[PDB]
């Protein structure tokens, strides 16, 4: 299917206790490949996907330098947020971005975004034209006027529509041997009594990549979407994912209920019964 590069920056301040902690994490599709953590005597951008060992060494130096320089502007930004919001120097606060770019299977750009969060709430985003800024409150409005004056969005649009794109393609090819693979779920149903005359069916799906999946319960055909309780898609920790959806059923009617599992890794939608 399509593909993406997605980055996630978090800066957390700890007043009294020195300077802020700054973490960068980066994903292609649903696999993390790089990380930056400033809690080190000498922090470096580091690989987290093996195919990333193919980059030429100058890469890690250049990336480490940009991270430190970014970490510095986030210190500034946090301090600036206290002025904008008339807060005291006492507490710990959070500042975040997330951004990225999307590409079709053929490799063509089609979407980009940029977003900014103070203490967990929307702060300022880039509109979908990749040219104007949506400022969430009167405080962010001060940042919105700044970034129009300095024509910030152009550098943003530029990165999002060009360098981001060129780079994601190189990463995809560099990690072809795994990144364009799609392991199918390995499903199964489990039986737990829920009452005297009521039982719980649970439909499992383990070991699958990528993380997008459909678990639906059907009774004779019609979905039980409002009578199913899914759990959050969770990671297995080895680069695979897990999910389950469950329905509580009037006892003895198990054969009525059926579970369809769609997945990119399934030649055809698997169906299952207890």
């Amino acid at each position: 299917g399509s593909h993406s590069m997605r980055y996630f920056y978090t800066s957390v301040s700890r007043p009294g206790l020195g300077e802020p902690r700054f973490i960068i994490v980066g994903y292609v599709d649903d696999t993390q490949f790089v990380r930056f953590d400033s809690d080190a005597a000498s922090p470096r951008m580091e690989q987290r996907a093996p195919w990333m060992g193919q980059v030429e060494p100058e890469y890690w130096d250049q990336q480490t330098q940009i991270a430190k320089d970014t970490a510095q502007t986030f210190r500034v930004n946090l301090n600036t947020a206290l002025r904008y919001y008339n807060q005291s120097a006492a507490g710990s606060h959070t500042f975040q971005t997330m951004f990225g770019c999307e590409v079709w299977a053929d490799g063509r750009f089609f979407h980009g975004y940029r977003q900014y969060a103070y203490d967990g709430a929307d702060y300022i985003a880039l509109n979908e034209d990749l040219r104007s800024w949506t400022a969430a409150d009167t405080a962010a409005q001060n940042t919105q006027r700044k970034w129009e004056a300095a024509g910030e969005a152009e550098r943003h649009r530029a990165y999002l529509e060009r360098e981001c794109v060129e780079w994601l393609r190189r990463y995809l090819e560099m990690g072809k041997e795994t990144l364009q693979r799609a392991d199918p779920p390995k499903a199964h149903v489990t039986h737990h009594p829920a009452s005297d005359r009521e039982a719980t069916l649970r439909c499992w799906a383990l070991g699958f990549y990528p993380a997008e999946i459909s678990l639906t319960w059907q009774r004779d055909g019609e979905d039980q979407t409002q009578d199913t309780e899914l759990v959050e898609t969770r990671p297995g920790g080895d680069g695979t994912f897990q999910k389950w959806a469950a329905v509580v059923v009037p006892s003895g009617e198990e054969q009525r209920y059926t579970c369809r599992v769609q997945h990119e890794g399934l030649p055809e939608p698997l169906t299952l019964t207890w």
């Binding site: 947020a81 300022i124 962010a140 940042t143 910030e152 943003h156």
Partner: peptide
């Protein structure tokens, strides 16, 4: 590849 440009709010 992270962007070199990083703006001040």
């Amino acid at each position: 590849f992270v962007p070199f440009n990083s703006p001040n709010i």
